[PDB]
């Protein structure tokens, strides 16, 4: 099991300045890092792949660099709309995993978002990932769980095509996963549910996450 530290929880920081957020691997992860800003109510968005691979869309001001241990993104010249969230995530082996996050701050509305339902401990319930705009059956999806304040967990993933599927063992009897190639849509049943299962969980594909399902017991 890989442990991705994050240096720290918060960091306080004011706009034009330049700040460093780093990450460390307790285990060589080679170059496989991504970073994630998540502003809140809101789905996590891609920043840096492959250590320092700036995604699509993602201004100069966000800089990825690190190898093998120590991680580093950083933020040129801060912005308002770069308050955020920050995480990092290594994908060199299972299961895949993410450092605790780090809010950046400085020194409005939000109605159902996302949605979800309400069940009971004991129950068990089946949330449902809809795909649309691209060939759903060459693109693996996983499923990350995210209770409030904490970090993010990866569940598992499941190859489309042929159903190949991988489980976190943490969850390898309580969560199950299917997909319906008929209609694009990624199903996971959860089982046996307890006060702990109550979270956000995602369903994502590489660059895109789900809006993600409220799931709460009581």
């Known amino acids: 099991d890989i442990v991705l530290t994050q240096s720290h929880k918060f960091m306080s920081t004011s706009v034009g300045d330049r700040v460093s957020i780093t990450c460390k691997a307790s285990?060589?992860?080679?170059?496989?890092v991504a970073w994630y800003q998540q502003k809140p109510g809101q789905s996590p968005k891609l920043l840096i792949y492959?250590?320092?691979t700036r995604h699509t869309g993602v201004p100069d001001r966000f800089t990825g660099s690190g190898s093998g241990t120590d991680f580093t993104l950083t933020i040129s010249n801060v912005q308002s709309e770069d308050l955020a969230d920050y995480f990092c995530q290594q994908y060199s082996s299972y299961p895949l995993t993410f450092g605790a996050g780090t809010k950046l701050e400085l020194k409005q509305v939000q109605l159902q978002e996302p949605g979800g339902e309400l069940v009971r401990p004991g129950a068990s319930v089946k949330l449902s990932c809809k795909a649309s705009?691209?060939?759903?059956?060459?693109?693996?999806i996983n499923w990350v769980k995210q209770r409030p304040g904490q970090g993010l967990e990866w569940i598992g993933n499941?190859?489309?095509?042929?159903?190949?599927?991988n489980y976190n063992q943490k969850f390898k009897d309580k969560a199950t996963l299917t997909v319906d190639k008929s209609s694009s849509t990624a199903y996971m049943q959860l089982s046996s549910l307890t006060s702990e299962d109550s979270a956000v969980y995602f369903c994502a594909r590489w660059g895109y996450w789900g809006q993600g399902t409220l799931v709460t017991v009581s």
């Open positions: 285990q060589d992860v080679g170059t496989a």
């Open positions: 492959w250590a320092s």
């Open positions: 499941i190859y489309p095509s042929d159903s190949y599927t």
């Open positions: 705009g691209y060939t759903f059956t060459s693109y693996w």
